[PDB]
């Protein structure tokens, strides 16, 4: 929030440091009112719910097994049981190597089959083992993390650190008409140019009001009007 | 490569535009240390 | 009254300063140069030959400065003030003994002069060495002048101390959004090279250089260096740690993905990628060119079959990169005072003289060859006439370099601008501050505050206030009052002592149990491993304190990267401290009374092992008491006197611990613009600009430092009677009210002195 | 260089007491304060005019060009 | 209390100490085994040792690719440069007394794959030299002295050792402070 | 810690995989697990005592065995004696109250154990003669003893 | 997989060789291993996650002084948080930033 | 002041022997710092308030601060009573050595008077380490503004 | 050579960073005086002390006054030097206020000043910056050959 922030706003840089989304909730309850909507906007939880990963070989088949425990999902209130994880894994396989088949047996003890040039099966098995527990199984693959904040009024709202604005406005459990972000360029792409002008004016007023500088609002208004 | 071509005669902080066109050196001017004076009126 | 150690402890500081002056870096370095490095360079570039005339050779047997035979202290020199007045250069002649022959195969000698060498003020060669009050007066020299500068063409120039990042030391630095890149700039006598050790992608680590093509995997170079087991790599760069093995083993299979490897195949892979030999003997262009390209990858020299030392060097570099991959904050800081070295005036003059000597030898050889191009009457007699005519180029170049400060060399292709600076004569303290001043290293990076902040580690080694604000804040530094820079002592003789003490050779241990023990290092190169590192370090420190090894060799430990480090190079800032044993100081008071009486001139304190030197790194092992009343029975040292945190210019402030720090810095800056006495011969002098005070006065509130630097003999100020009050409204913001009739009686009365130089030169007509 | 004739604050003539001060210090050894008080220097300004003095002329005179 | 007079014995011996970077020791409480070897090799003026260990075909041999790529591979070849280290002394207890014999050099033996290199030298086909290049050229040019193993003929060395150690009785002249100057 | 998964001498080789938090603790157990023979000052004193009793036990164990050998690391340039090396150089004597020391004749030292080696070691005599070159096998190296001078 | 070949310690691989066998190849020396009668597997433990906590803020335990807010007529502020961490020049004095503990108005002096 | 150093001793010994209760935003290593960084701030403020209350009528620093012509009660509290805590880059002074700020303190030190807390006043005179910490804190702004 | 009188505009300093430019030069009679008639050479605004926090200056003034009276030079060194209580005792043994504040008279009206004044010797220094070397003024004259600008 210093002259680097003023410089970013003034330069209209497409990438800034520390972008923050302010999502306004609907309810007020710490347990199963804020966490149920925080769980829908988070990062790669495959290794966060996998609880181990196995590399298994046999007479003719080469396996990769993951034992996705359900107690952690029962604690962190998440909306995914078996097939959401399987669909995410198949999407990741399409993204990275290949989609052939995914077996599910019990307690989410998923298995993955491999076959195709020598040692290619071993190389691909090693790559899959290393790169498996790094694919998003729920939420937004564009957002670092979210934290629930206790407001001065007592309200319990969470604010998001990343670039997923439209997805957050669309997620269930948040007020989409009251949701803002740091990025004026993000506001411009989704909300329009007048919204971006308002965002520029507010961000300048905040960055120069938190430092103790007393500037008339009309100067900043003219700056925004010229910039946009 | 320290040679002064035509392009080098127009660029930089001390070129034509930023050194001799938008900002110059003027006649009838001076410069010395300052001291206070209460009995000097403001203005 | 008896001798109280609590208050009489500080008397060691005057004893130190008596035999180790404030200007002693310059003096000591130049002394050592003219005593040893001249002969070393002569021994290096000794014999100049010719292809023709197979019975002909030229040899330099011996060199000297300002001395022909063993008597009378020959070569009367023009006094420095005479040189200063006449616009000459204070220099002395260089002599050599020439070994030349004839077609009759005779051995003849001589005492041949080969130019003039500028002599540093107050050295073994300067006339002012150990002058008396009378002699200085006869030669028109002020006794209170610091010294340590050159007069060249009538101007006083000084070589500032130059900050550098230490050479031959692994420096692991992380980075965000990328990974870890670690480097080691290895500068040998003639070639310098940085073996960057970077991370490209995928969590695999490569090797880099300017003489290799692209991205050598570390497993391949480790196989090229004799570690071909492909599991010996694992136990080397990961130990037994699971968190390291999985993060490293990505690239354990890149040495098999291309194909299986042996040593020769890996060498071939590397050697296909080297650049060239600058178009010379390209018949080596095979696997055999790696027998030299692995030799030229680090300052570590391999000259036989085994590559174990360089192999394990790269393995340890790999281990550091793997640790920094596991987590940041295992990296080291490049602004840490213990990661930096100091280079003095003699060290640079050595390089300059070597380069000039080589150019002179080349031109002498071409002149001899051209004379011999005639097919008749090859008369080697009077060949020394050519050397006597041609030798003026070395003197001219020496003067040009040492009076321009632009050092452009060719042996290293190093080009620096602004080495020397003109000595400032604005006050007595201005020159003394020009000495003991340190200029920053390269990679200035003004936009970042890294090399700008004060460091806790510079306690008692660099002055905490002396800093020029403006735009060079934190880049220029100054020395503290009690410091001492090291000299490169040895590397070999103490390695045998290491092996005697209990460490095992690196060629006996296994990669399996390498990381289960503490490993000793010598100047950053792994030497072995030892059990009981504490016992090893205790015995080593005892042997150094009893004088069996050098007094500037530092040994310590590091529990993070389990190791004991031993440093022996030059350029490390030290400072004396008092050893405390079993909760008892080793001074015992009697030693202090003996020092006061006249014995024990601070050399016997080191000789008896009561005090000792410490660099920044051994201070990590140290645990020092500020005052004697703070000595718990778990301390290691006690400092001699805790006001040497400040330097010489900072020693003028009274009660500096009662002001804010920016005020102390502002006083350090502007105590050098104060006008007063300058020297005892300021009226015999003729300078570009002088400022003098008619009636200077001693300050009423002294400091223990101004007595040590003789500021009370050449002071610049007056004790005014002051009334702190609001008066007349003309003193509103840093404006003063001066008493007329104090000016009339003569108060703040000064004098200016400029000079004009004219030359009546001769023309070709 | 040499002792100033008068005192910067008062105007009291102290130019004739430098030699007396030195003689009192050397012969008939005395404290500096008692020497200053025996010389009639009572105000602290006049006392400092003689206490805080460096005789630089004796050091400039070793370099006379007419030796 | 109890005193073990350790003696010193004949130094006119070219003792060498082998180290194997592959084969471990003490797979269990048992102190492992000493492998069967044959066809040792040496190289004077470079001290390049070479040792041959014959492989086993009845277990884990892969004869097909073995023969298909390399003409015959039934022996393991270990190379290794024998470096000179100072202060090493080999100890064996003959009586309650210890017996010290110096080690001339120590070599660290690592696997040597000649057959792959031969594969390149058959397939890819279809001036002062100072430093380690000269050493490499000497080692690969003047080569291949030939040796014979002696697995258990240790019946002609201990006698000399127990005799070359019982041949002198000396007295020291260096003091305790003096040794500090020596070392 | 954990371990990822004539017959037993030819099974695939697996590395030692100890947890990062544990490696410091087990490192004081790995040293005593590499032998398997058939506040930084107190720790080092205890290690010295344990190594002393260990090496005394080994000295007793190797009373008379053909294939057992030991390696001693000595200070280079040990005190040269007077000609009356070859012969007897002091003694390695067991001290009192469970201590061990080595005497060279005028100087006493500290005798300890070296680093632990996880491989085989063999001692070999060599001859350069062209008529016959031999490699006589003697025994297998037991362990390493490092000797350090002390006041 | 990370297993090493006995007697050469190089590396073990799974090979797409002949007759559909995924045996444990070496590629450095002639060493083979039949997988038949399988028990091999590679277990990698994985820390899952923890229940994260809020970030309300702790204005308590922050530096406090005794000043007056500029907009006193609106909010009555007799205390304020501060830091003396702005120094323009050395000759010029330090600068102190405040914030109203009552309303939250930042300003500097 | 001795009261607030005993509580800091208690917090240090708790965080060492066991696992101290962890504040929401920060970790166990940061919980201790963020606690003592207010445990010292409160005592600094109370001592300053006491000295201002005891200040005399016709005290020139007080008249200037009350006038708004020069200075502040914070400045005069630093001059008279205590200049408390020297912080750089946002919090207490980072280590310059291995697990230490200076070689005069024991290894693994987090007590006040070891990380940039001065209990002296300018009237009393800073010790060598307080002197150095205050020097670093002062240099920060100088190297920032340019 | 050139001899220079401390004109109005010359810069001074006091070893505590309190640099300043001479603002006015006043006659001796228009200066506050004590019982003995001592008149100060320099008067400095007290407003430079509280915001800059230079109390080493104050201790220097007291120590200098006591040392002048006692006939000895005093030591102000880092983490030590002459103690303030000793200087106060020496200053009270000679009939001066222990805190260095003295009752002076106005020189313009003659009557006592209603506030006691901090009075004593402070070591100053004259700096090389002089208004003589800075006063520049141009009406017309030399111009650059290329741009024809001053
Ligand atoms: C995690 C890193 C992702 C980053 C590279 C991607 C992810 C989201 C992207 C932004 C959004 O699309 C919205 C905007 C669209 C405009 O046209 C250009 C700007 C704008 C801010 C984008 C810039 C850039 O493309 C971003 C930051
Ligand atoms: Mg200013
Ligand atoms: Zn007077
Ligand atoms: Zn193999
Ligand atoms: Zn408010």
PDB file of N, CA and C in Angstrom, chain C residues 482-539:
ATOM      1  N   UNK C 482      40.125  -0.154  16.682  1.00  0.00           N
ATOM      2  CA  UNK C 482      40.928  -1.354  16.919  1.00  0.00           C
ATOM      3  C   UNK C 482      40.534  -2.414  15.894  1.00  0.00           C
ATOM      4  N   UNK C 483      41.173  -2.374  14.730  1.00  0.00           N
ATOM      5  CA  UNK C 483      40.996  -3.389  13.707  1.00  0.00           C
ATOM      6  C   UNK C 483      42.360  -3.882  13.258  1.00  0.00           C
ATOM      7  N   UNK C 484      42.347  -4.939  12.451  1.00  0.00           N
ATOM      8  CA  UNK C 484      43.563  -5.474  11.848  1.00  0.00           C
ATOM      9  C   UNK C 484      43.157  -6.394  10.712  1.00  0.00           C
ATOM     10  N   UNK C 485      43.621  -6.104   9.513  1.00  0.00           N
ATOM     11  CA  UNK C 485      43.334  -6.921   8.340  1.00  0.00           C
ATOM     12  C   UNK C 485      44.404  -7.996   8.211  1.00  0.00           C
ATOM     13  N   UNK C 486      43.980  -9.196   7.832  1.00  0.00           N
ATOM     14  CA  UNK C 486      44.865 -10.346   7.777  1.00  0.00           C
ATOM     15  C   UNK C 486      45.740 -10.314   6.529  1.00  0.00           C
ATOM     16  N   UNK C 487      46.792 -11.121   6.565  1.00  0.00           N
ATOM     17  CA  UNK C 487      47.650 -11.368   5.418  1.00  0.00           C
ATOM     18  C   UNK C 487      47.586 -12.846   5.076  1.00  0.00           C
ATOM     19  N   UNK C 488      47.527 -13.149   3.780  1.00  0.00           N
ATOM     20  CA  UNK C 488      47.511 -14.531   3.321  1.00  0.00           C
ATOM     21  C   UNK C 488      48.741 -15.263   3.831  1.00  0.00           C
ATOM     22  N   UNK C 489      48.552 -16.238   4.717  1.00  0.00           N
ATOM     23  CA  UNK C 489      49.699 -16.848   5.377  1.00  0.00           C
ATOM     24  C   UNK C 489      50.195 -18.085   4.638  1.00  0.00           C
ATOM     25  N   UNK C 490      49.369 -19.121   4.572  1.00  0.00           N
ATOM     26  CA  UNK C 490      49.764 -20.407   4.014  1.00  0.00           C
ATOM     27  C   UNK C 490      48.495 -21.179   3.691  1.00  0.00           C
ATOM     28  N   UNK C 491      48.666 -22.346   3.082  1.00  0.00           N
ATOM     29  CA  UNK C 491      47.572 -23.301   3.016  1.00  0.00           C
ATOM     30  C   UNK C 491      48.061 -24.696   3.374  1.00  0.00           C
ATOM     31  N   UNK C 492      49.311 -25.002   3.034  1.00  0.00           N
ATOM     32  CA  UNK C 492      49.846 -26.356   3.141  1.00  0.00           C
ATOM     33  C   UNK C 492      50.364 -26.750   4.525  1.00  0.00           C
ATOM     34  N   UNK C 493      51.215 -25.954   5.186  1.00  0.00           N
ATOM     35  CA  UNK C 493      51.846 -26.453   6.423  1.00  0.00           C
ATOM     36  C   UNK C 493      50.867 -26.809   7.527  1.00  0.00           C
ATOM     37  N   UNK C 494      49.699 -26.165   7.579  1.00  0.00           N
ATOM     38  CA  UNK C 494      48.733 -26.473   8.628  1.00  0.00           C
ATOM     39  C   UNK C 494      47.836 -27.654   8.279  1.00  0.00           C
ATOM     40  N   UNK C 495      47.780 -28.056   7.008  1.00  0.00           N
ATOM     41  CA  UNK C 495      47.034 -29.254   6.637  1.00  0.00           C
ATOM     42  C   UNK C 495      47.656 -30.501   7.252  1.00  0.00           C
ATOM     43  N   UNK C 496      48.986 -30.557   7.293  1.00  0.00           N
ATOM     44  CA  UNK C 496      49.659 -31.653   7.977  1.00  0.00           C
ATOM     45  C   UNK C 496      49.324 -31.654   9.461  1.00  0.00           C
ATOM     46  N   UNK C 497      49.223 -30.470  10.064  1.00  0.00           N
ATOM     47  CA  UNK C 497      48.798 -30.389  11.457  1.00  0.00           C
ATOM     48  C   UNK C 497      47.370 -30.892  11.624  1.00  0.00           C
ATOM     49  N   UNK C 498      46.490 -30.572  10.672  1.00  0.00           N
ATOM     50  CA  UNK C 498      45.139 -31.121  10.708  1.00  0.00           C
ATOM     51  C   UNK C 498      45.181 -32.641  10.731  1.00  0.00           C
ATOM     52  N   UNK C 499      45.899 -33.241   9.780  1.00  0.00           N
ATOM     53  CA  UNK C 499      45.941 -34.700   9.697  1.00  0.00           C
ATOM     54  C   UNK C 499      46.584 -35.313  10.931  1.00  0.00           C
ATOM     55  N   UNK C 500      47.538 -34.615  11.543  1.00  0.00           N
ATOM     56  CA  UNK C 500      48.128 -35.093  12.789  1.00  0.00           C
ATOM     57  C   UNK C 500      47.105 -35.059  13.916  1.00  0.00           C
ATOM     58  N   UNK C 501      46.248 -34.036  13.935  1.00  0.00           N
ATOM     59  CA  UNK C 501      45.337 -33.853  15.056  1.00  0.00           C
ATOM     60  C   UNK C 501      44.252 -34.918  15.125  1.00  0.00           C
ATOM     61  N   UNK C 502      43.917 -35.564  14.013  1.00  0.00           N
ATOM     62  CA  UNK C 502      42.932 -36.623  14.072  1.00  0.00           C
ATOM     63  C   UNK C 502      42.008 -36.764  12.881  1.00  0.00           C
ATOM     64  N   UNK C 503      41.964 -35.770  11.995  1.00  0.00           N
ATOM     65  CA  UNK C 503      41.131 -35.893  10.805  1.00  0.00           C
ATOM     66  C   UNK C 503      41.723 -36.952   9.878  1.00  0.00           C
ATOM     67  N   UNK C 504      40.845 -37.658   9.167  1.00  0.00           N
ATOM     68  CA  UNK C 504      41.234 -38.659   8.183  1.00  0.00           C
ATOM     69  C   UNK C 504      41.221 -38.059   6.787  1.00  0.00           C
ATOM     70  N   UNK C 505      42.144 -38.521   5.951  1.00  0.00           N
ATOM     71  CA  UNK C 505      42.229 -38.021   4.587  1.00  0.00           C
ATOM     72  C   UNK C 505      40.924 -38.280   3.848  1.00  0.00           C
ATOM     73  N   UNK C 506      40.630 -37.422   2.870  1.00  0.00           N
ATOM     74  CA  UNK C 506      39.394 -37.567   2.119  1.00  0.00           C
ATOM     75  C   UNK C 506      39.427 -38.820   1.251  1.00  0.00           C
ATOM     76  N   UNK C 507      40.615 -39.378   1.014  1.00  0.00           N
ATOM     77  CA  UNK C 507      40.792 -40.564   0.187  1.00  0.00           C
ATOM     78  C   UNK C 507      40.788 -41.853   0.993  1.00  0.00           C
ATOM     79  N   UNK C 508      40.097 -41.882   2.128  1.00  0.00           N
ATOM     80  CA  UNK C 508      40.036 -43.088   2.940  1.00  0.00           C
ATOM     81  C   UNK C 508      38.601 -43.401   3.344  1.00  0.00           C
ATOM     82  N   UNK C 509      37.768 -42.375   3.422  1.00  0.00           N
ATOM     83  CA  UNK C 509      36.411 -42.510   3.925  1.00  0.00           C
ATOM     84  C   UNK C 509      35.474 -42.907   2.791  1.00  0.00           C
ATOM     85  N   UNK C 510      34.282 -43.360   3.167  1.00  0.00           N
ATOM     86  CA  UNK C 510      33.265 -43.811   2.231  1.00  0.00           C
ATOM     87  C   UNK C 510      32.144 -42.792   2.115  1.00  0.00           C
ATOM     88  N   UNK C 511      31.490 -42.791   0.957  1.00  0.00           N
ATOM     89  CA  UNK C 511      30.341 -41.921   0.775  1.00  0.00           C
ATOM     90  C   UNK C 511      29.162 -42.348   1.634  1.00  0.00           C
ATOM     91  N   UNK C 512      29.146 -43.597   2.103  1.00  0.00           N
ATOM     92  CA  UNK C 512      28.047 -44.060   2.942  1.00  0.00           C
ATOM     93  C   UNK C 512      27.999 -43.295   4.259  1.00  0.00           C
ATOM     94  N   UNK C 513      29.058 -43.399   5.060  1.00  0.00           N
ATOM     95  CA  UNK C 513      29.104 -42.776   6.375  1.00  0.00           C
ATOM     96  C   UNK C 513      29.821 -41.432   6.358  1.00  0.00           C
ATOM     97  N   UNK C 514      29.733 -40.697   5.249  1.00  0.00           N
ATOM     98  CA  UNK C 514      30.370 -39.387   5.184  1.00  0.00           C
ATOM     99  C   UNK C 514      29.653 -38.379   6.068  1.00  0.00           C
ATOM    100  N   UNK C 515      28.322 -38.375   6.038  1.00  0.00           N
ATOM    101  CA  UNK C 515      27.517 -37.361   6.704  1.00  0.00           C
ATOM    102  C   UNK C 515      27.166 -37.714   8.139  1.00  0.00           C
ATOM    103  N   UNK C 516      27.695 -38.809   8.667  1.00  0.00           N
ATOM    104  CA  UNK C 516      27.485 -39.188  10.055  1.00  0.00           C
ATOM    105  C   UNK C 516      28.544 -38.598  10.973  1.00  0.00           C
ATOM    106  N   UNK C 517      29.458 -37.795  10.434  1.00  0.00           N
ATOM    107  CA  UNK C 517      30.561 -37.217  11.184  1.00  0.00           C
ATOM    108  C   UNK C 517      30.702 -35.741  10.837  1.00  0.00           C
ATOM    109  N   UNK C 518      31.513 -35.047  11.629  1.00  0.00           N
ATOM    110  CA  UNK C 518      31.846 -33.654  11.367  1.00  0.00           C
ATOM    111  C   UNK C 518      33.013 -33.591  10.391  1.00  0.00           C
ATOM    112  N   UNK C 519      32.878 -32.783   9.345  1.00  0.00           N
ATOM    113  CA  UNK C 519      33.882 -32.690   8.296  1.00  0.00           C
ATOM    114  C   UNK C 519      34.615 -31.360   8.337  1.00  0.00           C
ATOM    115  N   UNK C 520      35.952 -31.436   8.341  1.00  0.00           N
ATOM    116  CA  UNK C 520      36.801 -30.255   8.448  1.00  0.00           C
ATOM    117  C   UNK C 520      36.993 -29.654   7.066  1.00  0.00           C
ATOM    118  N   UNK C 521      37.160 -28.338   7.017  1.00  0.00           N
ATOM    119  CA  UNK C 521      37.363 -27.620   5.767  1.00  0.00           C
ATOM    120  C   UNK C 521      38.615 -26.767   5.891  1.00  0.00           C
ATOM    121  N   UNK C 522      39.348 -26.632   4.794  1.00  0.00           N
ATOM    122  CA  UNK C 522      40.521 -25.765   4.722  1.00  0.00           C
ATOM    123  C   UNK C 522      40.283 -24.788   3.581  1.00  0.00           C
ATOM    124  N   UNK C 523      39.959 -23.545   3.929  1.00  0.00           N
ATOM    125  CA  UNK C 523      39.692 -22.484   2.960  1.00  0.00           C
ATOM    126  C   UNK C 523      38.513 -22.818   2.054  1.00  0.00           C
ATOM    127  N   UNK C 524      37.576 -23.622   2.550  1.00  0.00           N
ATOM    128  CA  UNK C 524      36.385 -23.955   1.801  1.00  0.00           C
ATOM    129  C   UNK C 524      36.461 -25.235   1.002  1.00  0.00           C
ATOM    130  N   UNK C 525      37.555 -25.979   1.103  1.00  0.00           N
ATOM    131  CA  UNK C 525      37.729 -27.241   0.401  1.00  0.00           C
ATOM    132  C   UNK C 525      37.752 -28.373   1.414  1.00  0.00           C
ATOM    133  N   UNK C 526      36.899 -29.369   1.209  1.00  0.00           N
ATOM    134  CA  UNK C 526      36.764 -30.449   2.176  1.00  0.00           C
ATOM    135  C   UNK C 526      38.069 -31.227   2.289  1.00  0.00           C
ATOM    136  N   UNK C 527      38.502 -31.458   3.525  1.00  0.00           N
ATOM    137  CA  UNK C 527      39.771 -32.106   3.795  1.00  0.00           C
ATOM    138  C   UNK C 527      39.592 -33.487   4.411  1.00  0.00           C
ATOM    139  N   UNK C 528      38.490 -33.726   5.112  1.00  0.00           N
ATOM    140  CA  UNK C 528      38.279 -35.009   5.762  1.00  0.00           C
ATOM    141  C   UNK C 528      37.097 -34.943   6.699  1.00  0.00           C
ATOM    142  N   UNK C 529      37.130 -35.800   7.712  1.00  0.00           N
ATOM    143  CA  UNK C 529      36.135 -35.761   8.769  1.00  0.00           C
ATOM    144  C   UNK C 529      36.814 -36.139  10.073  1.00  0.00           C
ATOM    145  N   UNK C 530      36.221 -35.701  11.174  1.00  0.00           N
ATOM    146  CA  UNK C 530      36.793 -35.921  12.494  1.00  0.00           C
ATOM    147  C   UNK C 530      35.668 -36.189  13.481  1.00  0.00           C
ATOM    148  N   UNK C 531      35.921 -37.091  14.419  1.00  0.00           N
ATOM    149  CA  UNK C 531      35.089 -37.223  15.601  1.00  0.00           C
ATOM    150  C   UNK C 531      35.652 -36.334  16.700  1.00  0.00           C
ATOM    151  N   UNK C 532      34.766 -35.860  17.565  1.00  0.00           N
ATOM    152  CA  UNK C 532      35.083 -34.842  18.561  1.00  0.00           C
ATOM    153  C   UNK C 532      35.556 -33.552  17.895  1.00  0.00           C
ATOM    154  N   UNK C 533      34.698 -32.888  17.117  1.00  0.00           N
ATOM    155  CA  UNK C 533      35.080 -31.580  16.574  1.00  0.00           C
ATOM    156  C   UNK C 533      35.378 -30.557  17.650  1.00  0.00           C
ATOM    157  N   UNK C 534      34.708 -30.646  18.799  1.00  0.00           N
ATOM    158  CA  UNK C 534      34.990 -29.730  19.896  1.00  0.00           C
ATOM    159  C   UNK C 534      36.417 -29.901  20.395  1.00  0.00           C
ATOM    160  N   UNK C 535      36.849 -31.149  20.578  1.00  0.00           N
ATOM    161  CA  UNK C 535      38.223 -31.407  20.994  1.00  0.00           C
ATOM    162  C   UNK C 535      39.213 -30.940  19.937  1.00  0.00           C
ATOM    163  N   UNK C 536      38.897 -31.174  18.662  1.00  0.00           N
ATOM    164  CA  UNK C 536      39.762 -30.696  17.585  1.00  0.00           C
ATOM    165  C   UNK C 536      39.929 -29.179  17.636  1.00  0.00           C
ATOM    166  N   UNK C 537      38.819 -28.448  17.757  1.00  0.00           N
ATOM    167  CA  UNK C 537      38.868 -26.988  17.751  1.00  0.00           C
ATOM    168  C   UNK C 537      39.555 -26.457  19.004  1.00  0.00           C
ATOM    169  N   UNK C 538      39.338 -27.102  20.149  1.00  0.00           N
ATOM    170  CA  UNK C 538      40.008 -26.677  21.373  1.00  0.00           C
ATOM    171  C   UNK C 538      41.518 -26.837  21.255  1.00  0.00           C
ATOM    172  N   UNK C 539      41.971 -27.984  20.748  1.00  0.00           N
ATOM    173  CA  UNK C 539      43.406 -28.180  20.577  1.00  0.00           C
ATOM    174  C   UNK C 539      43.973 -27.197  19.563  1.00  0.00           C
TER     175      UNK C 539
END
